[PDB]
RNA sequence: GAUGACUCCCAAGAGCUCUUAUCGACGGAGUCGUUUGGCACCUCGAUGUCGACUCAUCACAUCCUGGGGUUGAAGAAGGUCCCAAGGGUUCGGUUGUUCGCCGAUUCAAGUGGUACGUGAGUUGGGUUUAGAACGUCGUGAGACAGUUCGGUUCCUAUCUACCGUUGGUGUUAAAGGGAGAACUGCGAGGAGCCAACCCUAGUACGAGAGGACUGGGUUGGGCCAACCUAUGGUGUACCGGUUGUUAUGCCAAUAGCAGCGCCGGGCAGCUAAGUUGGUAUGGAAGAACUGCUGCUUAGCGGGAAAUCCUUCUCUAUACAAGUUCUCGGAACAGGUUUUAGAACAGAACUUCGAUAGGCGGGAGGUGGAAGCACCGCGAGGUGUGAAGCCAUCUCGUACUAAACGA
């Protein structure tokens, strides 16, 4: 994947921040079915161009969504106003090269992404709460017809006077699993719309039933 | 959504008594996170007073009980909300005191003699319109 | 076995925080946290 | 970055002395012990061992530095990351192509006396692997190593 | 999943009638529809090419495990049945070669994709 | 450290020729602490003993993958040896088995350490209590390092360790100095698998038989991360069928109860049997191993699934405590929820409002409501009628509860 979008030979173009709308099922011309995800880009715009000259690093501050003065907390109302930039639901920074540097106040959209090529998403995933092992890590469990008060628990660290009561950094039942996990080197974008600025992807994009995803690798 | 921590038979057979008493009397003082639950059966038993047919009456015969609060509904609550489209209870949070830190709540109907928060007037709904998705409100400042 | 040091350290961070904003029925007597049904008028 | 390299001289006592150790590119340990003294204030008369009066000593041009023998590719630095198994190891060639400051900083750190004023002494030490330093406008005393270098020579 | 201990029907016209799985050459749970299984004959006519108590390979043709084609479509037969192939006791050249003369009972044409075109050609009619 | 395993020394003889490919007789040299052991130093006012399950971890003296030397290496399969621990190391049959034999497989079915790992994690079959019996010994009481049957497994976690979640605090500063975002990422973790098949190619090699080297391509398994739109499973406040009984006088239509009473269904949610997605490139240093210079001191270059950077994750209590924007009645706090959730936390909404409920409209599930009309004596059927209802989902509407005068 090269010679597309808008840049020179080699750089990283900025990322674009969208919302997981759901999944559906398309078909191809060769009569085969692929699952589909629709990522909705809410008129994302540039709100701060970060600078090695002044600040120290090369970053485009893309805002997404829409918000209202009754919903922002004044310390950011001031930010948006000083930038003179329409209000957005969530901010997000990207580090991109010296080229691929945008003017304050240029909106982005899905035609930034050439179809047929790949992306990398980052979606703060769907935690499940204070789960335990055997689901958190796919541990096994002792039988259900012989052993008591263990039917679903775990084992015990290596342990004896040597490795003296020193459980190394092991694997225990633990709190939730909501985090940001990329799906590296995604599979090509089916289609993106001129209006409505959606985009369909072959499937399995992390993030909630809405409100969370980022995209890069292009 | 609430379980209240009760076997799903006993839970109903309590909620029935609660809505029925809420209709016999006009106000009750109950634990809030359970008032937040009769908040639904009361209205779905007002709707049957509004419909009043034989079908939607013999159905209410199952959900309300104790006394002829059945007739109380059908006769007065209809005629006092023949217009009010939705929202037939107030569910205020009195937290009076208990000995168990359990909150407490007044729950009672709306257009009576002495209500608690002197209501707004029952206005008929406006009729539906087609939804659109412009997403054109910049909200800049 | 474990002494005042640890006992105080454990019972401390479970300290009582004075309650924030607290309102009274201007004339109807009672005092209350917000969002209560003290009174009527 | 003038800021991020000017350090925390806003924290020490300043009012004693600024001194400059510029290794001419000769030898680690014989730079080092001299430092571990000057940067411990045991070299002036008014010493008292319950305090820090370490003078500012500033080393210069650690790129031009010489370590004899062939330890360069033999003596690594070893460190243990807690996680079972691991032992992250790095030779001195790696270390010197990375940052030839860390080398001597760590060395004098180990030489300094093993008490909790050690960190509170290194808080009085700064390094540039050039000759270029922003600590010039302050009273600058360049320093000379002892006149004790006979330097035995071999065939 | 057709796995160890399963007891599935022979559906070619070789000697054996009932064949009891012991393996799945390319699974770790049972083998889904269309994959070679290893198994031990359990009953035969006295005169066929195969005699009871003899490890023999096989290919799956009917499995109560639902399976979907790539078309999103899904199919699931009633019972488990397989057709024999001569064991590896013959070299790699004969890989995927049957034993009998004619199977009988509907067959899925995922055998083609799975490269079992040999048994496929004999099929009554491919589902 | 005797025996033990391994290495090394020497080299009679075997290897048709040949000592050293491969071995290697006699006799020695050492390394390790794993079998057998020796000693009796810690523990008998207690250090719970075999095997299995779970959970791993290290060493490398290497089973495969990974590179090279060499071969009695034509090619291919090998042999042996050097480097190498990154990732792997299967199921089942009899036995309690560890071991081991076996059958079926794989790239391989590694050797030890870790109190012969692991009972305040589990099991408790052996074995070391009481019963009982067989053979043998004892002249009996009884024993058996022989055999078989049965023979209570305690602990509410203080601390260290460890998985996670948070509150305070320190951080020059200007407002009493209080904050909200947005990074950078000193540095820590994570991921590194393999087969088949096709091609190049019946090409090099070989008399064919046979059968390459390498690089590209596909198809699979394992491992891991993520997602339920479909399919399955469930779906306990849904729809319908249905039995026993009690009530609403009875018909009608409902209710309670039978641990959804039992059936057939079942959306959203959750899960995997399903679906995705990864198993990389680039860069440096550099292993034996290999070459060339040298100038006898040295010089550099290839050179391994290895190490370190690039991806992913975590991070400024990173104490040299970092940088940018903005707020200053600013941040909180409380209330309705939540795609988030044990409390806390995050995120949404807080009346110039869609935050939840409610009501209307659909969607989505069940599957022909009641009353009425007909047909038949009836059980019952047909029409009125995709009727009737509604757990969820969307969409309209502030009708309810989320302003605030502390």
State both tokens at A178. 């909501």
State both tokens at A167. 């459980």
Q: C-alpha distances in angstroms, E82 versus E9, E60, E87, E91?
A: 6, 4, 14, 21
- The DSSP result for B48-115, as a single string, is HHHH--SHHHHTHHHH--SSTHHHHIIIIIHHHSSS--S---B--------SS----EEEE-SSSSS-
Contact D12, D124 (CB under 8 A): yes
Helix (H, G, I), strand (E, B) or coil at A78: helix
Characterize B73-92 residue by residue with b for buried, 16 or more Cβ atoms within 10 angstroms of its Cβ, and e for exposed: bbeebbebbeebeeebbbeb
A138 touches strand F (CB under 7 A): yes
Q: Tokens 């993106």 — which residue?
A: A192
- The DSSP result for B27-41, as a single string, is EEEE-HHHHHHHHHH
Phi, psi of D7, rounded to the nearest 5 degrees: 70, -155
Give the total residue count for chain B.
141
State both tokens at D120. 């509170």
DSSP β-ladder status, A90-95 and D141-142: unpaired
Question: Measured between alpha carbons, how far is B87 from B110 in angstroms, rounded to an integer?
Answer: 9
Residue A138: HSE in the Cβ half-sphere, 13 Å Cα cutoff: 0
E117: alpha, beta or left? (left if phi > 0; alpha if psi -120 to 50): alpha
Q: Tokens 């001129």 — which residue?
A: A194
CB atoms within 10 A of CB D126: 20
State both tokens at D127. 């390094």
CB atoms within 10 A of CB B135: 11
Helix (H, G, I), strand (E, B) or coil at A87: coil
Contact A200, A40 (CB under 8 A): no
C35: alpha, beta or left? (left if phi > 0; alpha if psi -120 to 50): left
Give the closest-approach CA distance of E73 to chain A in angstroms.
10
Q: CA–C1' distance B64–F147 (Å)? A: 77
Which residues in chain C are closer than 8 Å to B95, comparing Cβ atoms? Answer: 32-33, 36
For residue B43, the surrounding DSSP H or E stretch is: helix B32-51
A159 touches strand F (CB under 7 A): yes
Contacts of D136 (CB under 8 A, 6+ apart): none
Burial class of residue E32, CB neighbours in 10 A (0-12, 13-18, 19+): middle
Question: Measured between alpha carbons, how far is C20 from E51 in angstroms, rounded to an integer?
Answer: 88
Report DSSP state, residue A90: E
Whether residue B129 lies within 8 A of chain A, CB to CB, comes out as: no
Tell me which residues from 1 to 41 on chain C have a beta carbon below 7 angstroms from nucleic acid strand F. 2, 6, 13, 20-24, 26, 33-35
DSSP β-ladder status, A35-41 and A90-95: unpaired
Helix (H, G, I), strand (E, B) or coil at B123: coil
Residue A209: HSE in the Cβ half-sphere, 13 Å Cα cutoff: 0
Q: Tokens 């217009």 — which residue?
A: B83
State both tokens at A16. 């674009």
Mutate to test the interface with A, among D84, D85, D86, D87 (most CBs of A within 10 A): D84
Q: Tokens 């369909």 — which residue?
A: A200
Contacts of B15 (CB under 8 A, 6+ apart): B37, B38, B41
Question: Measured between alpha carbons, how far is B116 from A120 in angstroms, rounded to an integer?
Answer: 57
Q: What is the resolution of this structure in A?
A: 3.9
CB atoms within 10 A of CB D87: 8
Q: CA–C1' distance A3–F198 (Å)? A: 32
Contact D127, D104 (CB under 8 A): yes
Contacts of A19 (CB under 8 A, 6+ apart): A39, A40, A41, A42, A64, A65, A210, A211, A212, A213
Q: Tokens 């893309």 — which residue?
A: A62
Question: Measured between alpha carbons, how far is B41 from B15 in angstroms, rounded to an integer?
Answer: 8
Question: Measured between alpha carbons, how far is D103 from D131 in angstroms, rounded to an integer?
Answer: 18
Phi, psi of D67, rounded to the nearest 5 degrees: -125, 115
Give the closest-approach CA distance of B19 to chain C in angstroms.
22
Which residues in chain D are closer than 8 Å to A169, comparing Cβ atoms? Answer: 82-84
Report DSSP state, residue D153: -
Contact A62, A45 (CB under 8 A): yes
Question: Measured between alpha carbons, how far is E8 from E16 in angstroms, rounded to an integer?
Answer: 11
Whether residue A31 lies within 8 A of chain E, CB to CB, comes out as: yes
Question: Measured between alpha carbons, how far is A17 from A211 in angstroms, rounded to an integer?
Answer: 10
Question: Measured between alpha carbons, how far is E45 from E17 in angstroms, rounded to an integer?
Answer: 7
CB atoms within 10 A of CB A171: 12
For residue C7, the surrounding DSSP H or E stretch is: helix C4-11
């Amino acid at each position: 994947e090269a010679k597309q979008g808008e840049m020179s030979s080699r750089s990283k173009r900025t990322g674009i921040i969208a919302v997981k709308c759901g999944m559906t099922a398309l078909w191809d011309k060769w009569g085969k079915r692929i699952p589909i995800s629709i990522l909705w880009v809410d008129d994302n715009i540039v709100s701060q161009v970060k600078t090695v000259e002044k600040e120290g690093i090369f970053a485009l501050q893309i805002g997404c969504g829409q918000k209202k003065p009754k919903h922002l907390s004044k310390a950011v109302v001031g930010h948006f106003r000083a930038q003179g930039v329409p209000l957005k639901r969530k901010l997000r920074e990207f580090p991109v090269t010296e080229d691929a540097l945008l003017p304050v106040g240029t909106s982005l959209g899905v035609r930034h992404f050439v179809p047929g090529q790949y992306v990398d998403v980052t979606g703060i995933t769907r935690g499940k709460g204070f789960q335990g092992c055997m689901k958190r890590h796919g541990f096994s469990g002792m039988p259900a017809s012989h052993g008591a008060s263990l039917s679903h628990r775990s084992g015990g660290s290596t342990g004896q006077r040597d490795a003296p009561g020193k459980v190394f950094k092991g694997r225990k039942m633990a709190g939730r699993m909501g985090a940001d996990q990329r799906t590296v080197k995604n599979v090509w974008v089916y289609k993106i719309d001129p209006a409505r600025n959606l985009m369909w992807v072959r499937g399995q994009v992390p993030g909630a039933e809405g409100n969370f995803v980022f995209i890069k690798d292009a | 959504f609430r379980k209240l921590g009760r076997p799903a038979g006993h839970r109903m057979s309590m909620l029935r008594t609660m809505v029925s008493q809420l209709v016999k009397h006009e106000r009750i003082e109950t634990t809030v996170t359970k008032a937040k639950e009769v908040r639904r059966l009361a209205d779905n038993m007002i709707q049957l007073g509004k419909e009043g047919s034989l079908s939607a009456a013999r159905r209410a015969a199952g959900f309300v009980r104790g006394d002829d609060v059945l007739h109380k509904i059908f006769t007065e609550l209809a005629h006092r909300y023949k217009d009010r489209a939705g929202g037939y209870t107030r569910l205020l949070r009195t937290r009076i005191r208990v000995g168990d830190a359990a909150p407490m709540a007044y729950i009672e109907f709306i257009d009576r003699e002495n209500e608690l928060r002197q209501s707004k007037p029952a206005t008929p709904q406006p009729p539906q319109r087609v939804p659109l998705d412009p997403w054109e409100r910049s909200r800049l400042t | 076995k474990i002494s005042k040091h640890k006992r105080g350290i454990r019972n401390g961070p479970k300290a009582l925080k004075p309650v924030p904003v607290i309102i009274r029925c201007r004339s109807c007597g009672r005092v209350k946290l917000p969002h209560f049904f003290c009174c009527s008028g | 970055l003038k800021k991020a390299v000017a350090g925390i001289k806003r924290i020490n006592l300043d009012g004693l002395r600024w001194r400059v150790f510029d290794a001419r590119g000769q030898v680690l340990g014989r730079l080092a012990s001299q430092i571990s003294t000057v940067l411990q204030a045991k070299d002036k008369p008014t010493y008292c061992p319950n305090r820090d009066d370490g003078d500012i000593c500033i080393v210069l041009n650690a790129k031009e530095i010489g370590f004899t023998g062939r330890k360069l590719t033999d003596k690594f630095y070893r460190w243990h990351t807690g996680y079972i198994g691991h032992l992250k190891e790095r030779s001195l060639k790696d270390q010197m192509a990375k940052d030839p400051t860390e080398v001597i900083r760590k060395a004098v750190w180990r030489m300094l006396p093993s008490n909790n004023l050690r960190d509170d002494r290194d808080r009085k030490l700064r390094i540039f692997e050039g000759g270029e330093h922003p600590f010039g406008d302050k009273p600058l005393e360049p320093f000379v190593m002892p006149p004790r270098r006979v330097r035995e020579m071999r065939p | 999943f057709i796995q160890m201990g399963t007891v599935l029907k022979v559906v070619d016209n070789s000697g054996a009638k009932k064949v009891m799985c012991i393996q799945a050459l390319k699974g770790k749970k049972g083998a889904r529809l269309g994959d070679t299984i290893v198994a031990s004959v359990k009953e035969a006519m006295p005169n066929g090419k195969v005699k009871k108590g003899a490890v023999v390979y096989g290919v799956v043709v009917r499995a109560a495990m639902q399976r979907g084609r790539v078309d999103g479509s899904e199919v699931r037969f009633d019972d488990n049945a397989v057709v024999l192939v001569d064991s590896k006791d013959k070299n790699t050249k004969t890989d995927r070669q049957p034993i009998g003369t004619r199977v009988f009972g509907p067959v899925p044409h995922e055998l083609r994709k799975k490269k079992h075109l040999k048994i496929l050609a004999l099929a009554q009619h491919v589902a």
